[PDB]
Design an enzyme around this catalytic site. Structure first.
Site, PDB file in Angstrom:
ATOM      1  CE1 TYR B  26      38.903  39.418  48.863  1.00 16.30           C
ATOM      2  CE2 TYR B  26      39.482  39.585  46.501  1.00 16.30           C
ATOM      3  CZ  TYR B  26      39.614  39.994  47.791  1.00 16.30           C
ATOM      4  OH  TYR B  26      40.474  41.027  47.990  1.00 16.30           O
ATOM      5  CG  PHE B  36      41.689  42.128  39.777  1.00 20.32           C
ATOM      6  CD1 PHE B  36      41.299  42.442  41.080  1.00 20.32           C
ATOM      7  CD2 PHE B  36      40.746  41.819  38.800  1.00 20.32           C
ATOM      8  CE1 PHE B  36      39.935  42.422  41.368  1.00 20.32           C
ATOM      9  CE2 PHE B  36      39.381  41.817  39.095  1.00 20.32           C
ATOM     10  CZ  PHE B  36      38.976  42.128  40.391  1.00 20.32           C
ATOM     11  CG  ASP B  37      42.814  41.080  45.580  1.00 21.95           C
ATOM     12  OD1 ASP B  37      43.660  40.543  46.233  1.00 21.95           O
ATOM     13  OD2 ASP B  37      42.159  41.857  46.200  1.00 21.95           O
ATOM     14  CB  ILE B  56      32.032  47.423  44.536  1.00 22.96           C
ATOM     15  CG1 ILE B  56      32.558  45.968  44.517  1.00 22.96           C
ATOM     16  CG2 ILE B  56      33.268  48.325  44.495  1.00 22.96           C
ATOM     17  CD1 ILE B  56      33.177  45.343  43.259  1.00 22.96           C
ATOM     18  CE1 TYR B  82      36.485  49.767  43.221  1.00 20.88           C
ATOM     19  CE2 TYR B  82      36.669  47.709  41.997  1.00 20.88           C
ATOM     20  CZ  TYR B  82      36.676  48.413  43.176  1.00 20.88           C
ATOM     21  OH  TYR B  82      36.988  47.761  44.319  1.00 20.88           O
ATOM     22  CG  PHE B  99      34.976  39.511  42.734  1.00 17.83           C
ATOM     23  CD1 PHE B  99      34.337  40.573  42.082  1.00 17.83           C
ATOM     24  CD2 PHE B  99      36.163  39.701  43.464  1.00 17.83           C
ATOM     25  CE1 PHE B  99      34.893  41.847  42.193  1.00 17.83           C
ATOM     26  CE2 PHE B  99      36.696  40.987  43.547  1.00 17.83           C
ATOM     27  CZ  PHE B  99      36.045  42.026  42.916  1.00 17.83           C
TER      28      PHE B  99
HETATM   29  C1  LIG Z   1      44.104  51.547  52.614  1.00 21.96           C
HETATM   30  C2  LIG Z   1      43.054  51.411  52.284  1.00 21.96           C
HETATM   31  C3  LIG Z   1      41.846  50.994  52.915  1.00 21.96           C
HETATM   32  C4  LIG Z   1      41.076  49.622  52.554  1.00 21.96           C
HETATM   33  C5  LIG Z   1      42.017  48.846  51.699  1.00 21.96           C
HETATM   34  C6  LIG Z   1      42.513  47.657  51.755  1.00 21.96           C
HETATM   35  C7  LIG Z   1      42.155  46.722  52.866  1.00 21.96           C
HETATM   36  C8  LIG Z   1      43.479  47.419  50.564  1.00 21.96           C
HETATM   37  C9  LIG Z   1      44.035  46.120  49.922  1.00 21.96           C
HETATM   38  C10 LIG Z   1      45.117  46.517  48.949  1.00 21.96           C
HETATM   39  C11 LIG Z   1      43.216  45.191  49.038  1.00 21.96           C
HETATM   40  C12 LIG Z   1      41.847  45.733  48.667  1.00 21.96           C
HETATM   41  O1  LIG Z   1      40.835  44.931  49.401  1.00 21.96           O
HETATM   42  C13 LIG Z   1      41.021  43.866  50.351  1.00 21.96           C
HETATM   43  C14 LIG Z   1      41.756  45.762  47.153  1.00 21.96           C
HETATM   44  O2  LIG Z   1      40.699  44.858  46.686  1.00 21.96           O
HETATM   45  C15 LIG Z   1      40.638  44.826  45.256  1.00 21.96           C
HETATM   46  O3  LIG Z   1      41.734  44.055  44.862  1.00 21.96           O
HETATM   47  C16 LIG Z   1      39.390  43.935  45.007  1.00 21.96           C
HETATM   48  O4  LIG Z   1      39.597  42.763  44.735  1.00 21.96           O
HETATM   49  C17 LIG Z   1      38.124  44.684  45.383  1.00 21.96           C
HETATM   50  O5  LIG Z   1      37.568  45.263  44.380  1.00 21.96           O
HETATM   51  N1  LIG Z   1      37.471  44.552  46.511  1.00 21.96           N
HETATM   52  C18 LIG Z   1      37.850  43.669  47.676  1.00 21.96           C
HETATM   53  C19 LIG Z   1      36.984  42.492  48.034  1.00 21.96           C
HETATM   54  C20 LIG Z   1      35.535  43.067  48.054  1.00 21.96           C
HETATM   55  C21 LIG Z   1      35.011  43.792  46.825  1.00 21.96           C
HETATM   56  C22 LIG Z   1      36.016  44.917  46.461  1.00 21.96           C
HETATM   57  C23 LIG Z   1      35.758  46.009  47.566  1.00 21.96           C
HETATM   58  O6  LIG Z   1      34.722  46.466  47.739  1.00 21.96           O
HETATM   59  O7  LIG Z   1      36.852  46.481  48.050  1.00 21.96           O
HETATM   60  C24 LIG Z   1      36.737  47.763  48.839  1.00 21.96           C
HETATM   61  C25 LIG Z   1      36.805  49.084  48.199  1.00 21.96           C
HETATM   62  C26 LIG Z   1      38.019  49.293  47.263  1.00 21.96           C
HETATM   63  C27 LIG Z   1      35.652  49.779  48.216  1.00 21.96           C
HETATM   64  C28 LIG Z   1      35.415  51.127  47.722  1.00 21.96           C
HETATM   65  C29 LIG Z   1      35.105  51.966  48.955  1.00 21.96           C
HETATM   66  C30 LIG Z   1      34.636  53.400  48.603  1.00 21.96           C
HETATM   67  C31 LIG Z   1      33.629  53.455  47.527  1.00 21.96           C
HETATM   68  O8  LIG Z   1      33.442  54.881  47.120  1.00 21.96           O
HETATM   69  C32 LIG Z   1      34.024  52.675  46.305  1.00 21.96           C
HETATM   70  O9  LIG Z   1      33.034  52.648  45.301  1.00 21.96           O
HETATM   71  C33 LIG Z   1      33.400  52.955  44.066  1.00 21.96           C
HETATM   72  C34 LIG Z   1      34.352  51.175  46.622  1.00 21.96           C
HETATM   73  C35 LIG Z   1      37.705  47.613  49.955  1.00 21.96           C
HETATM   74  C36 LIG Z   1      37.595  46.259  50.746  1.00 21.96           C
HETATM   75  C37 LIG Z   1      37.628  48.736  50.927  1.00 21.96           C
HETATM   76  O10 LIG Z   1      36.460  48.764  51.830  1.00 21.96           O
HETATM   77  C38 LIG Z   1      38.834  48.716  51.911  1.00 21.96           C
HETATM   78  C39 LIG Z   1      39.815  49.865  51.713  1.00 21.96           C
HETATM   79  O11 LIG Z   1      39.695  50.567  50.726  1.00 21.96           O
HETATM   80  C40 LIG Z   1      40.442  46.184  44.610  1.00 21.96           C
HETATM   81  C41 LIG Z   1      40.389  46.132  43.075  1.00 21.96           C
HETATM   82  C42 LIG Z   1      41.560  47.112  45.107  1.00 21.96           C
HETATM   83  C43 LIG Z   1      41.485  47.166  46.602  1.00 21.96           C
HETATM   84  O12 LIG Z   1      42.461  48.065  47.181  1.00 21.96           O
HETATM   85  C44 LIG Z   1      41.845  49.327  47.463  1.00 21.96           C
HETATM   86  C1  LIG Z   2      43.883  58.750  51.929  1.00 24.33           C
HETATM   87  C2  LIG Z   2      43.544  58.712  50.873  1.00 24.33           C
HETATM   88  C3  LIG Z   2      44.126  59.050  49.617  1.00 24.33           C
HETATM   89  C4  LIG Z   2      43.600  60.259  48.685  1.00 24.33           C
HETATM   90  C5  LIG Z   2      42.649  61.034  49.530  1.00 24.33           C
HETATM   91  C6  LIG Z   2      42.553  62.273  49.874  1.00 24.33           C
HETATM   92  C7  LIG Z   2      43.541  63.287  49.391  1.00 24.33           C
HETATM   93  C8  LIG Z   2      41.336  62.480  50.814  1.00 24.33           C
HETATM   94  C9  LIG Z   2      40.534  63.748  51.210  1.00 24.33           C
HETATM   95  C10 LIG Z   2      39.612  63.370  52.343  1.00 24.33           C
HETATM   96  C11 LIG Z   2      39.546  64.449  50.291  1.00 24.33           C
HETATM   97  C12 LIG Z   2      39.253  63.698  49.004  1.00 24.33           C
HETATM   98  O1  LIG Z   2      39.887  64.453  47.892  1.00 24.33           O
HETATM   99  C13 LIG Z   2      40.696  65.643  47.934  1.00 24.33           C
HETATM  100  C14 LIG Z   2      37.756  63.470  48.932  1.00 24.33           C
HETATM  101  O2  LIG Z   2      37.185  64.170  47.775  1.00 24.33           O
HETATM  102  C15 LIG Z   2      35.763  64.015  47.725  1.00 24.33           C
HETATM  103  O3  LIG Z   2      35.269  64.862  48.719  1.00 24.33           O
HETATM  104  C16 LIG Z   2      35.411  64.705  46.378  1.00 24.33           C
HETATM  105  O4  LIG Z   2      34.994  65.850  46.440  1.00 24.33           O
HETATM  106  C17 LIG Z   2      35.885  63.856  45.211  1.00 24.33           C
HETATM  107  O5  LIG Z   2      34.966  63.092  44.742  1.00 24.33           O
HETATM  108  N1  LIG Z   2      36.992  64.045  44.536  1.00 24.33           N
HETATM  109  C18 LIG Z   2      38.035  65.107  44.791  1.00 24.33           C
HETATM  110  C19 LIG Z   2      38.248  66.202  43.781  1.00 24.33           C
HETATM  111  C20 LIG Z   2      38.349  65.457  42.415  1.00 24.33           C
HETATM  112  C21 LIG Z   2      37.222  64.525  41.998  1.00 24.33           C
HETATM  113  C22 LIG Z   2      36.996  63.498  43.139  1.00 24.33           C
HETATM  114  C23 LIG Z   2      38.230  62.529  43.007  1.00 24.33           C
HETATM  115  O6  LIG Z   2      38.465  61.971  42.035  1.00 24.33           O
HETATM  116  O7  LIG Z   2      38.764  62.261  44.148  1.00 24.33           O
HETATM  117  C24 LIG Z   2      39.707  61.084  44.185  1.00 24.33           C
HETATM  118  C25 LIG Z   2      39.237  59.711  44.424  1.00 24.33           C
HETATM  119  C26 LIG Z   2      38.327  59.541  45.663  1.00 24.33           C
HETATM  120  C27 LIG Z   2      39.347  58.885  43.366  1.00 24.33           C
HETATM  121  C28 LIG Z   2      39.027  57.468  43.304  1.00 24.33           C
HETATM  122  C29 LIG Z   2      40.357  56.757  43.089  1.00 24.33           C
HETATM  123  C30 LIG Z   2      40.189  55.243  42.806  1.00 24.33           C
HETATM  124  C31 LIG Z   2      39.135  54.929  41.824  1.00 24.33           C
HETATM  125  O8  LIG Z   2      38.910  53.451  41.820  1.00 24.33           O
HETATM  126  C32 LIG Z   2      37.823  55.594  42.131  1.00 24.33           C
HETATM  127  O9  LIG Z   2      36.829  55.372  41.156  1.00 24.33           O
HETATM  128  C33 LIG Z   2      35.639  54.961  41.569  1.00 24.33           C
HETATM  129  C34 LIG Z   2      37.947  57.150  42.267  1.00 24.33           C
HETATM  130  C35 LIG Z   2      40.790  61.491  45.116  1.00 24.33           C
HETATM  131  C36 LIG Z   2      41.407  62.909  44.830  1.00 24.33           C
HETATM  132  C37 LIG Z   2      41.895  60.497  45.170  1.00 24.33           C
HETATM  133  O10 LIG Z   2      42.801  60.436  44.006  1.00 24.33           O
HETATM  134  C38 LIG Z   2      42.862  60.790  46.354  1.00 24.33           C
HETATM  135  C39 LIG Z   2      42.804  59.758  47.472  1.00 24.33           C
HETATM  136  O11 LIG Z   2      41.912  58.929  47.451  1.00 24.33           O
HETATM  137  C40 LIG Z   2      35.293  62.574  47.706  1.00 24.33           C
HETATM  138  C41 LIG Z   2      33.763  62.427  47.662  1.00 24.33           C
HETATM  139  C42 LIG Z   2      35.895  61.862  48.926  1.00 24.33           C
HETATM  140  C43 LIG Z   2      37.385  61.985  48.844  1.00 24.33           C
HETATM  141  O12 LIG Z   2      38.067  61.294  49.918  1.00 24.33           O
HETATM  142  C44 LIG Z   2      38.508  60.011  49.462  1.00 24.33           C
END
Ligand SMILES: C=CC[C@@H]1/C=C(\C)C[C@H](C)C[C@H](OC)[C@H]2O[C@@](O)(C(=O)C(=O)N3CCCC[C@H]3C(=O)O[C@H](/C(C)=C/[C@@H]3CC[C@@H](O)[C@H](OC)C3)[C@H](C)[C@@H](O)CC1=O)[C@H](C)C[C@@H]2OC
Ligand SMILES: C=CC[C@@H]1/C=C(\C)C[C@H](C)C[C@H](OC)[C@H]2O[C@@](O)(C(=O)C(=O)N3CCCC[C@H]3C(=O)O[C@H](/C(C)=C/[C@@H]3CC[C@@H](O)[C@H](OC)C3)[C@H](C)[C@@H](O)CC1=O)[C@H](C)C[C@@H]2OC
Lengths: 107, 107
Positions: B26, B36-37, B56, B82, B99
């Site tokens: 992708y 971006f990726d 997602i 997101y 994508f």
């Molecule tokens: C260390 C980390 C662990 C592990 C991270 C990697 C392998 C990190 C590596 C840099 C590249 C990432 O991926 C290969 C990268 O891909 C992006 O560039 C992108 O193109 C993306 O959007 N992707 C990837 C291809 C599938 C769709 C989407 C996805 O679904 O991605 C998923 C994702 C972010 C889903 C969340 C999961 C929780 C939900 O709460 C949330 O819902 C709001 C959506 C990815 C695959 C996660 O399962 C895997 C992890 O997070 C993001 C713009 C930023 C993202 O870095 C984070």
């Molecule tokens: C190793 C990992 C690194 C680091 C993780 C930890 C310290 C992990 C530890 C288990 C507990 C987490 O947090 C203390 C936990 O908190 C939840 O229980 C929760 O109550 C939550 O919702 N929170 C926390 C309090 C602020 C609001 C919200 C938040 O904003 O949280 C943030 C978050 C998930 C934001 C994403 C960021 C990317 C955007 O793309 C996306 O947008 C879609 C939103 C948190 C603080 C991140 O900055 C920090 C990281 O991810 C989530 C239900 C699940 C989440 O575990 C992931």
């Protein structure tokens, strides 16, 4: 995408500015009261900074409206939280989230 | 929350089932074409599984509609990506994502 209901007033004076660190206590719940997380049960306060895309936007906008010492219920729309995806095993798809937040300090 | 436009047809027969592993290539872009990726630029294919809240939702629903060998443009609504938060430093708030996906294999 956030509703803020106050449980206990803050000082009515000191509100979070972009780029300060907020120190809070929170518990997150689903809309039926089901807890999924609590800073208190890991003892610590949670700290984050405003304006860095580091917490979900609904949190950001909710806490920006609180003054120091305030305790409030933040109800956050899915698109200002985890949207249609949820968080695997913790938040369902399309979930409204409720956080009970206490703003303790700005650093 | 996803639109699927086909660039190259797949086999018209083999579609992703819940719990299979999809192997894809992708590139993700913003709606103006800004990349971006890209899995290709780290050489590897990306692999994920359907129905585990691990990608997602817009990806999930888009790829479920593709058959093996298909190349398609997935346009995903913010709430199926997101949402209002974006991804810090990479995806703005409220962004529609595009994508270009090739479904290579199901395992
Ligand atoms: C260390 C980390 C662990 C592990 C991270 C990697 C392998 C990190 C590596 C840099 C590249 C990432 O991926 C290969 C990268 O891909 C992006 O560039 C992108 O193109 C993306 O959007 N992707 C990837 C291809 C599938 C769709 C989407 C996805 O679904 O991605 C998923 C994702 C972010 C889903 C969340 C999961 C929780 C939900 O709460 C949330 O819902 C709001 C959506 C990815 C695959 C996660 O399962 C895997 C992890 O997070 C993001 C713009 C930023 C993202 O870095 C984070
Ligand atoms: C190793 C990992 C690194 C680091 C993780 C930890 C310290 C992990 C530890 C288990 C507990 C987490 O947090 C203390 C936990 O908190 C939840 O229980 C929760 O109550 C939550 O919702 N929170 C926390 C309090 C602020 C609001 C919200 C938040 O904003 O949280 C943030 C978050 C998930 C934001 C994403 C960021 C990317 C955007 O793309 C996306 O947008 C879609 C939103 C948190 C603080 C991140 O900055 C920090 C990281 O991810 C989530 C239900 C699940 C989440 O575990 C992931």
């Amino acid at each position: 995408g956030v509703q803020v209901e106050t449980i206990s007033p803050g000082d009515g004076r000191t509100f979070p500015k972009r780029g300060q660190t907020c120190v809070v206590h929170y518990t997150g719940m689903l809309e039926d009261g089901k807890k999924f997380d609590s800073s208190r049960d890991k003892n610590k306060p949670f700290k984050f900074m405003l304006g860095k895309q580091e917490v979900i936007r609904g949190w950001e906008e909710g806490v920006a409206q609180m003054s120091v010492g305030q305790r409030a219920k933040l109800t956050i729309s899915p698109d200002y939280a985890y949207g249609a995806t949820g968080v695997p095993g913790i938040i369902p798809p399309h979930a409204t989230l409720v956080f009970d937040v206490e703003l303790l300090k700005l650093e």
